[PDB]
Amino acid sequence: RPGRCYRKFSGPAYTRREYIPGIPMPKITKFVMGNVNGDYDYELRLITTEKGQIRHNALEAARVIALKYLSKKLASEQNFALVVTKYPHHVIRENKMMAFAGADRLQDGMRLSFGKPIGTAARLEKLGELVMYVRVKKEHLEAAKEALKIASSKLPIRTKIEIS
């Protein structure tokens, strides 16, 4: 389903697992890559500039592409540390009954319209929240800006890159 459906806030935070049966497993499983505790010079970060939600599909695709680019440059355990910070706590739900139960003269239309869970997302409730960062030495500062630019292309919210 198009991402414009689940990019905006519609309702409260829906996270309590004990009152929500049958939540699908998120696509993201590994949130920290590389060699943390390595000796690094630069600590550049990816910062959002709007409020919204990021589906767990967008969050996993932005991670595979960034890891492949950095691993393509020199190596994997070598001097880079890739970390994605936000976890998908919010649960997004769809009134799927328009598919099946909306055509049996079953509770069709908007009758009994509370939806069923379809996946998870990361609410971004503040302006300027950290989403990813990567740590490299001084010789790799350029291959690290490009990794974050390619990853920023697969995310719904407008972002920046900051160097420190």
């Binding site: 598919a99 099946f100 055509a103 049996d104 003269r105 069709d108």
Partner: peptide
Amino acid sequence: MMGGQSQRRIERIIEEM
């Protein structure tokens, strides 16, 4: 085994699942 007992929307399920 339906169901909707309506021609218009019974054909939806058979063409949807």
